[PDB]
Design a protein around this nucleic acid. Structure first.
Lengths: 99, 118, 81, 18, 111, 95, 75, 99, 83, 112, 96
DNA sequence: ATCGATGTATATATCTGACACGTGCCTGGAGACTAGGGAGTAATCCCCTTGGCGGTTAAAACGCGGGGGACAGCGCGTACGTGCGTTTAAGCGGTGCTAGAGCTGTCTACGACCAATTGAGCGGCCTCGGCACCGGGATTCTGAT
DNA sequence: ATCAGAATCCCGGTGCCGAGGCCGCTCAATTGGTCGTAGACAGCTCTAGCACCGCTTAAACGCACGTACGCGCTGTCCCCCGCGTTTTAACCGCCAAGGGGATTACTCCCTAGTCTCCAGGCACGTGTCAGATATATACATCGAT
C-alpha cells in the first residue's frame, strides 16, 4: 500500500504555499483571450498594451482573493468548512456589488 | 499611595473629585478607586488628590436633595461611629453633610492639585 | 474569436485562487459562478477603460486607462501608475 | 491644539507600536 | 539677487522637492492662490509617510535575509501596521501577495 | 527622446539612506512608491481644495493642510504627521 | 528663574536667567552650555519671534515656562 | 387561557409591517442629544450644536443601524436560523470592512 | 450628577424598533450591548470630523453643514440638510 | 443697441440656468478654460436626471392619494428603480424610511 | 442688516414639475433634497471632467469632456438617454 | 505509540541582468521687484442657542407564563480530496511587419476679460386648500374551536 | 373548515399652517468688443502590438477510490415574546439671557506675475553582485502497523 495523505492536508499545504507566493495564479494567454473577447463588445480592432493586460489580471486575482476570504467567513459562520455559491452571493450582497 | 488611602479624585474629563479608596494599581500611574456610589473604574495618578481628612481651608461643595453648586468650606471633621461628616459653613452658618455627599469642583480643586496631585 | 474562453479560467485556477484566500474544501458548484462574477468585474473595468480610450482619441488601451478605471471603482492599483 | 498651526504639540519619541 | 539660491527643501530641512509641490499645486487646479507654507507642509507629511513605510519594509526585508525591498515586503509592512491598514484599506499592491492567516477551525485537530 | 518624465525616484532613495543606510529598492517597488506619493498628494490636495471653498476662502495655506491631514490619516499617524508638518514649516519660516 | 528650553528633537535645557534680563545673556548662556553660534540658533516663544535686546518680563514669562530653540542652518 | 394571546412572532411581523411604512424618527430625541453632547466633550470642551445638526446626526445613525440590521438578517438566515446573535453583527461588519 | 452613563439612553425598545425597520423577527438578549458599542463607534467617527471642521472654521457651534460634510467624507451622504 | 437679451437657457430649450453653470464651473476650479457648450450639456443632463425622479415621485405619490411630494415618495421612487439605485447606492434621504420587505423565511408558515 | 442671497435650484425644479405633472406639488422639506441632489450630481460630472481634462494634458472643458464623463457616472440605460438630451440641446444652441 | 517517507528548509556553487552610479545638460526652480486684493482685525447686532419651569402621558421598565426556536447528538450517503496516468496547450525564443503612438510646426478660431445694462431670480407678505386629526363604522386576519 | 375578537382601513368632518403666488428690488447674467493662445491639423518617426512558427514540459484533465462532511432528524431546554401593571422621563409650551454667527468697514502684508541666471534631476550609459537557480541533505511531520 502506497502512502496516502488524509483528505484535508494537501489542501493546507497548498494554502500555506500560495499564501507565501506572489506569482499570478491563472494562465496569462487564456486570460488575454478573455479580456479581448470582453472588449470585443465595445469596439472592434482594439489593441492592448501588455502592461494593460497585466494590470487587469493583477486586479482580477486581487478581487477574487478578497471575495474568497469573505466567503470563508460566511462558510464558518454557517458552521461549515465547504464553501458554496450561496456564500458567494451572500458575500456579494453584503458588500453591495449586486444589491 | 498604597492600599488603604481615602483619596479624592476625578474619574473622567473635567470631572469632579470624588472620595474613594486605593484598591489596586492598573499600571502606568493609574490608581483604581472604589467610589461610594457603586462606580469603579481606572483613574490616572496625577488626577488624584491625597487628603485624609481634607484640610480645613479647602472649599468643597455640600450635597443634599437637589443641590449642585452649593459652595462652602469644611469647618469640622466629626467622626460619627466611623462615618466622618463635613461641617459646611456658608455665610457664617455651619451645616453638617456626609462624606459620601460632597464634591470638590474644578476651581476649588485647582487650589490643591499642585500640592496633593501625587 | 467567438470562442467562449470563459472556460479559459480553468478549474485548478479557481482552486489556486481560493486556496490563496484560505479555503480548505470547495464545492463543485463554485466554478460556474466564480467565472460569472469575474466576467462581470471585467465588463465593468473594460467598459470604463474603453471609454477612457474613446475620449483619448486612441485605438490602443494603455495601462493608465485601466488604472484610472479602477480608481473610479475604489480599487486602485499600485505599480502601474 | 486645533488652531494656528502649532508650537507646543510637537511630538513624543518614535511611535514604535511593534 | 544672486547668488547661491539656497534650496527650500534644505531651508525646511526636508528631503522632498518643496519646489515641485508648488508646480503640482498651482497647476493642479485646487485654488486661485497657494500659501507659502502649504508646499512645505505637504513635503513634510509626504516625507514622513514614505519614511514610515520604508522603515517597516526594511525590517520585513531583513526577516527574509534580503537587501532589496521587493513589493512583497511593502504589502507585508502595510497589512501588519493596522494604523496603515486603515490608510490603505482600498489599495491593492501588484505582486504583493496576501498575509498568511488560517482560521483555527480549519486547522487540523488531533485531540 | 526629449520628453522628460518626472517622478519621486531620487527622493525615495535619498530618504531610504537615512532610515536604512544599507538596503535598496527594486524598480517595481520604486514604481509602487511613485504611485503612493501621488495618491496621498492628490487625496490631501483635494481635501484642502474643498476646505478652501468650504469656508469661502480662496487661498491654500498650511492651516488647512494641517486640518486636512487630521481628516485622512487615522489615529496617531495624524499626530506624528502634524508634528512633522509644524517642525518643517517653523524651520522654513525662520530662514 | 528656572526656565527650560525645548528643542526640535526633544532635548530639555534649563536656563538660569532672571525674568528681567534681555536675550543677549540668554543666548550667551546657551553658548556657554552647548556652544552654538548666534547665527545657528534662534528663540521662539508662543509662535512669535524674540528680539535680542527685548526684556523677558515683557512676555509675562512665568516659572517653569517652556521655550523653543530653533537651529538656524546656513550653508 | 381566557385572555386572548397571539402566537409569538406575529406581533413582530405586525410591527415590522408598521415600521417599514413609517417615516418618523425612531430613536428618542433627548437621550440621543445627551449622547451627542457627551461624545463631543472628548474632542473639545464647551461645544454648541444646531438643532438641525443633531437631527442630521440622529437620522444618519438610524439609517446606518437599519442597514446593519438588514445585513444581520441575511447573516442569520444564512445560518439556517431566525434569531440574531451578536456574532451576526460582527460578521456583517467584518465583511463590510469596518473591522 | 456629572457625565452619567447616558448610553443607556438608547433604550432596549428603541433598538428593537430599528431592528424591525430592517425586518427582524427575533432579538437575542446580547444584541443590545453590541448595538450600543457599534453606535458609539459611529458617533465617534462622525463627530470627530465634524468637530475638526468646526475648529478649522474658527467657530464654536457645530452647524448641520459640518455634519453633512463629515458624513460625505465617509461616503454616507445625507440629502436635505445641505443648503 | 442690443435691442434684445435672449436667455441662454431658452436658446438651449432648457429650464435650468445654463448661465449659472458657467459661474459654477469657472469658480469651481476644474480648469482655466471652460467650453461654450459644456454648461449647456450639464444643464441638459441635469434636466433629464431630475425629470426621471420627478416622473417617478408623482406616480409614487398618486397611489398614496397625495398631491404633495413627501420625501417618502422620493425614496420609494428611487429605490424601486434598479438604475437610480446604482446612481444613489450610498445616498441616504432625510425622512425617507425603508422599502417594505419581509423575507419568505420570516413569513409565518401554517401550510396545512 | 443686508442679507446675502442664497442661490438655489428651487425655481427651476418647479418648472420641471409643471412639465411632468402640471397639478402636483412638492413640500419644502422634500424640496431641499432635490436641491441637494442637483448639487451632488453636478459635483460628480464637474469633478470627473476635471481629471479627464488632465488625462489628455488639456486645459479646457468642452462638451466632449462631459459626454464621456456622463458615460462613466450614469450607468447603462440612463447614460444613453442623458447623452441624447445633452447632444440635442447643444445642437439647438449651435444653430442659434 | 516508533518507523517510513515525503515535503521542506537547509547549506553551497554560480551566472546573470537588474541595480547603483558617473556624466551632460537643460529646463524647471530660485531670487528680486512690483502691484493688487484676499485675508486679518475691530466693532455691532440680533438671532439662535442654552437653561429653567410646569403639566400630561406615552413610553419605558419590571415581572411572569410558555411555547417555539436554538442547539447538541447521531446516522447516512454522497460529493469532494487525492493520487495517477494521459493529453492539451501554455510558455519561451526568434522573426517579420506595420498600425498606431508620439513628437513637431502652423495658425486660427475659441475663450478670458472688461464695460453697460437690464430682467431673471431672491426675500418678504399673504391666503387658502391639501394635509393632519378624530370619531365611527366596515372589513381582514387570527387563534381556539 | 368556523366564529369572537382585536387589528386595520375607509368615509366624513374639521381646522390649520405651510405651499404657492404676488411685488419689489439688487445684481448677476447678456451683449459687444478685443485678444492671446490651445488645440486642431498635417506631417514625420519609430516602437511596440500583432502575427507566425517551432520545441518543450509544465500543467490541465479524466478516472478511480474512499472517507470526511452536509444534512436531516430528534430530543431537550432555555430564553425571548406577549401582556399586564407600574414608574418616569420625554415632549410640548412658555419665558429670559447672552454667546456667538454673521455682517461691514478698514488696512496691508502676502502672493501672482515677470524676468534672469544657474544647478537638480533626468536620460543614458556601464560595471558588478543579490539573488534566482541546481543540486545534495539534515529535518520534521505526517500517518499507520
Amino acid at each position: 500500500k502506497p502512502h496516502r495523505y488524509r483528505p484535508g492536508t494537501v489542501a493546507l499545504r497548498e494554502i500555506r504555499r500560495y499564501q507565501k507566493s506572489t506569482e499570478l495564479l491563472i494562465r496569462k494567454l487564456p486570460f488575454q483571450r478573455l479580456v479581448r473577447e470582453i472588449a470585443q463588445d465595445f469596439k472592434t480592432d482594439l489593441r492592448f498594451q501588455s502592461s494593460a493586460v497585466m494590470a487587469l489580471q493583477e486586479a482580477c486575482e486581487a478581487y477574487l482573493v478578497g471575495l474568497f476570504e469573505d466567503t470563508n467567513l460566511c462558510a464558518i459562520h454557517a458552521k461549515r468548512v465547504t464553501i458554496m455559491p450561496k456564500d458567494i452571493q451572500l458575500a456579494r450582497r453584503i458588500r453591495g456589488e449586486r444589491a | 499611595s498604597f492600599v488603604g488611602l481615602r483619596v479624592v479624585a476625578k474619574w473622567s474629563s473635567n470631572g469632579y473629585f470624588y472620595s474613594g479608596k486605593i484598591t489596586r494599581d492598573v499600571g502606568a500611574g493609574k490608581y483604581k478607586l472604589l467610589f461610594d456610589d457603586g462606580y469603579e473604574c481606572d483613574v490616572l495618578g496625577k488626577d488624584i488628590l491625597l487628603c485624609d481628612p481634607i484640610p480645613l481651608d479647602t472649599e468643597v461643595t455640600a450635597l443634599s436633595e437637589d443641590e449642585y453648586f452649593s459652595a462652602g468650606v469644611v469647618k469640622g471633621h466629626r467622626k460619627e461611629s466611623g462615618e466622618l461628616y463635613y461641617s459646611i459653613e456658608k455665610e457664617g452658618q455651619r451645616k453638617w453633610y456626609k462624606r459620601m455627599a460632597v464634591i470638590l469642583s474644578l476651581e476649588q480643586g485647582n487650589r490643591l492639585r499642585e500640592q496633593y496631585g501625587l | 474569436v467567438l470562442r467562449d474562453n470563459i472556460q479559459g479560467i480553468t478549474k485548478p485556477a479557481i482552486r489556486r485562487l481560493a486556496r490563496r484566500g484560505g479555503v480548505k474544501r470547495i464545492s463543485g458548484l463554485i466554478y460556474e459562478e466564480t467565472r460569472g462574477v469575474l466576467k462581470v468585474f471585467l465588463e465593468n473595468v473594460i467598459r470604463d477603460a474603453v471609454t477612457y480610450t474613446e475620449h483619448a482619441k486612441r485605438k490602443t488601451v494603455t495601462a493608465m486607462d485601466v488604472v484610472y478605471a479602477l480608481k473610479r471603482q475604489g480599487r486602485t492599483l499600485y505599480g502601474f501608475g | 491644539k486645533a488652531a494656528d498651526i502649532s508650537l507646543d504639540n510637537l511630538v513624543e519619541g518614535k511611535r514604535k507600536r511593534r | 539677487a544672486r547668488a547661491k539660491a539656497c534650496t527650500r527643501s534644505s531651508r525646511a530641512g526636508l528631503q522632498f522637492p518643496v519646489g515641485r509641490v508648488h508646480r503640482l499645486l498651482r497647476k493642479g487646479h485646487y485654488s486661485e492662490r497657494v500659501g507659502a507654507g502649504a508646499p512645505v507642509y505637504l513635503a513634510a507629511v509626504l516625507e514622513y509617510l514614505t519614511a514610515e513605510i520604508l522603515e517597516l519594509a526594511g525590517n520585513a526585508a531583513r526577516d527574509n535575509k534580503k537587501t532589496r525591498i521587493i513589493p512583497r515586503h511593502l504589502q507585508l509592512a502595510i497589512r501588519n501596521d493596522e494604523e496603515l491598514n486603515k490608510l490603505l484599506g482600498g489599495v491593492t499592491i501588484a505582486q504583493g501577495g496576501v498575509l498568511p492567516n488560517i482560521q483555527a477551525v480549519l486547522l487540523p485537530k488531533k485531540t | 527622446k526629449r520628453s522628460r518624465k518626472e517622478s519621486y525616484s531620487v527622493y525615495v532613495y535619498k530618504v531610504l539612506k537615512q532610515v536604512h543606510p544599507d538596503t535598496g529598492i527594486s524598480s517595481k517597488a520604486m514604481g509602487i512608491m511613485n504611485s503612493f506619493v501621488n495618491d496621498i498628494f492628490e487625496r490631501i490636495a483635494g481635501e484642502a481644495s474643498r476646505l478652501a471653498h468650504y469656508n469661502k476662502r480662496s487661498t491654500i495655506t498650511s492651516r488647512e493642510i494641517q486640518t486636512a491631514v487630521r481628516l485622512l490619516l487615522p489615529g496617531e499617524l495624524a499626530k506624528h504627521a502634524v508634528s512633522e508638518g509644524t517642525k518643517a514649516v517653523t524651520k522654513y519660516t525662520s530662514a | 528663574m528656572q526656565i527650560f528650553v525645548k528643542t526640535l528633537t526633544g532635548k530639555t535645557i534649563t536656563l538660569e536667567v532672571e525674568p528681567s534680563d534681555t536675550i543677549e545673556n540668554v543666548k550667551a548662556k546657551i553658548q556657554d552650555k552647548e556652544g552654538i553660534p548666534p547665527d545657528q540658533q534662534r528663540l521662539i516663544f508662543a509662535g512669535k519671534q524674540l528680539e535680542d535686546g527685548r526684556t523677558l518680563s515683557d512676555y509675562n514669562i512665568q516659572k517653569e515656562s517652556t521655550l523653543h530653540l530653533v537651529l538656524r542652518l546656513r550653508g
